[model samples]
Target: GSSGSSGGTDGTKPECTLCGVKYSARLSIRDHIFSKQHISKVRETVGSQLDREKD
Candidate 1:
């Protein structure tokens, strides 16, 4: 399954597009993005991508 199943301005939940991780609420999404796990994953994914692009 993917993150953010639906969309709406009425307090709809948010998801991290980068990690495909779902959150139960907007606050949760905000917190998740700042967590170590998210940072590490971004570095791993984007770092490898940038490395490849340098070739």
Candidate 2:
């Protein structure tokens, strides 16, 4: 666990910019990052990029 000094936007709560989610604790944020929802969103984003590049 970090000392809440790094990876924050406003020097307070850390945020996941990819999904626009804020967490009260470090572990919570970490869990969210690896969650199914986040992974699915990432896949969708990359898939779109790949499709665009194929053209």
Candidate 3:
């Protein structure tokens, strides 16, 4: 039988909360908010929920 597992983070890793990416160190965190990737994902996700659901 298969068991259950989940993804997680620890107190030592640097991760991006918007796109599920981890970094090696802190350098441009605040500047990342306006990141091209994050900006597009926000629109796509908010526009269509980027899924098969309709509202």
Which lDDT values do the candidates have, in the order given? 0.72, 0.69, 0.63
Model 2: residue 34 alpha-carbon error in angstroms: 1.7
* Cα misplacement distance, residue 3 of candidate 3 (Å): 24
lDDT tens readout by residue for model 1, 5-37? 665558445777778787764458669878987
Q: Name model 1 segments beyond 4 Å from true.
A: 1-13, 48-55
Candidate 3 at 17: error in angstroms? 3.7
Candidate ranking under lDDT, highest first, comes to 1, 2, 3
**Candidate no. 1 TM-score:** 0.49
Q: How accurate is candidate 3 locally (lDDT)?
A: 0.63
Per-prediction TM-score: 0.49, 0.49, 0.43
Residue range 1-55, candidate 3, lDDT tens digits: 9897879966755667667655546545556556776677667666844467756
Positional deviation of residue 40's Cα in model 2 after best superposition, in angstroms: 1.4
Q: Which candidate should be chosen as best, given lDDT against the real structure?
A: 1
Clashing pairs in 3: none
Could you tell me the lDDT of residue 15 within candidate 1? 73
